[PDB]
Each structure stands twice: as C-alpha cells, then as structure tokens.
Amino acid sequence: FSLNFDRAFLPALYSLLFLLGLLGNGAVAAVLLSRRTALSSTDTFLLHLAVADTLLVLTLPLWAVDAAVQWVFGSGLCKVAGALFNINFYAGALLLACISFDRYLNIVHATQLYRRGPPARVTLTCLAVWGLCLLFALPDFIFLSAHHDERLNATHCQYNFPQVGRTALRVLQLVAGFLLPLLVMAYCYAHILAVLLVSRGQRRLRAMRLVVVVVVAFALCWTPYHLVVLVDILMDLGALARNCGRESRVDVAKSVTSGLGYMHCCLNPLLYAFVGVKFRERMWMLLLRL
C-alpha cells in the first residue's frame, strides 16, 4: 500500500516541485546577481537562500526518478545526492533564521547598528552557516551507502547503520532544523512587532502583516513533517506495539508532509523577495534592459 501510494504520488509532485522551484529561485538569483553591486545584508542572505533552494529542488528529481521503480545511479551518487540535499535543507533553515536575526538587528537596534555596524559580518555568518551544514551532512557521506535489502530488487539509497543512530540523526535533524529557526524567528519577529507597534507610521501596518504572514507560513508549513517524524521516531521505540497498518499510514503521511515542506521551500522566494518594493523595482530595471 505504501509503495503504491509512493509510486502514485512522488513522481508527478516532485516534477511539479522541480519546475516551480527552479523557476522561482532562478528568477530571484538572476535578479539579485546581475546588480550584485550595492547588496544589503538581507539581499545577500536571500541570494544564498535562493541558491540553496535551487540546489535542493534540482537534486530532488534525482530521487523523483528513483521512487518510481529502481536505482542504478551507484553508491557514490546516492551519497552525494543525499548529503547535498541535507546541506540544502539545513542551509534553508539556518538562512531563514539568519534573515530573521538580521531584520531584528536592523529594526530594533537601528541606531546602534547604523553607527556601529560591522562591515563583514554577513559573509562570516553565511560561511559559518554553510560550514555547519556540511558538518551536519557529513555522517550521510561517511555512513550511508547503497544498501542491498533485496528480497526482490529495490535497494535504492537507504542507510546501512543501526537503528539507534537513525533515532539520533532524526532527533538532531528535528532539534536543529526546527527548534533553532522556530525560536530565533519567534523571538526576533516578536521584538520587531513590539517595536513597530510602539512606533507610528504608514508602512508599519504592511510590515506587521508581512512579519505575521512569514512566521505563520514557515511554522505551519514545516510543522507537519517534523511533527510526524518526531511521532514515528519516538513511537516506534516503546510507545505502542507498532502494528502493520501503522507503517503504511505513517509512510503516506511522511510523503505528503515532505511534499508540503518542499512546497514551502519553493514558496519561500515569492514571499521574501517579490513582496519588497526594492526587489520589484530592481527586477523591473533589469527587465527593461533586456
């Protein structure tokens, strides 16, 4: 049942994610990269996030083809694709957190950052985030290879290391890639909202609406998959007898929730870049040239 649902769902949805994500995160990258001169911190973070999203939804087809029937890509390709997908996911999460923190700095501590702003913190933060991403994704290289759970073919990309390590890796993924973005975004944007609500103006209302939309969208979109993966990783241990149908329903839920997550990743640049007036004006200026 789970295999049939996977074969029915993953190919077409993954191809749609392919096309939409490449379109969006290529448009954003083209707009930001051409006028690379005079780039603000948020613009640099947005460019890096677009690159990460591009790589993620570009490597996703490599498993869209896998999920259909089989795998002939070899162990090395499995290692590379898995590790780079993990890198891209962690980069997306940490870059959203960094964007939130940078907005907090620019809005709350506006004067102090105006008069005491470091000139090279953006590159340092980006390099640290990417290095951390490789650090979290290295166990996929050093541990996972092509497996041979072959009662009848299959044997695509799965790990070959004990269950305790699987639980540890799942716990690490959950903790970092959810709790760090959630807490950082919540604190930074709550303080931003308080500062904006104290102040008086005309664009402040748009700022509050955009902040609320961003927080709600990210939390709602990445809640289901992390919640279901936590449920499975805590539940298989000792929570219940783990009957037969549970595996099928939880695998279907994991598939659809991962699809929702990837939908959030491809929706990211529309919500972040295209709403700003500066980015739209830059895009219009670039389009007028061609």
Binding site: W63, F85, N86, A154, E247, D251, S258, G261
Partner: peptide, 8 residues
C-alpha cells in the same frame, strides 16, 4: 527527507 524509508 525524500528517502521513503524501506522500513518493512
């Protein structure tokens, strides 16, 4: 994340 675990 798209692994579609081979569990059972």
């Amino acid at each position: 994340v798209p692994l579609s675990r081979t569990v059972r």
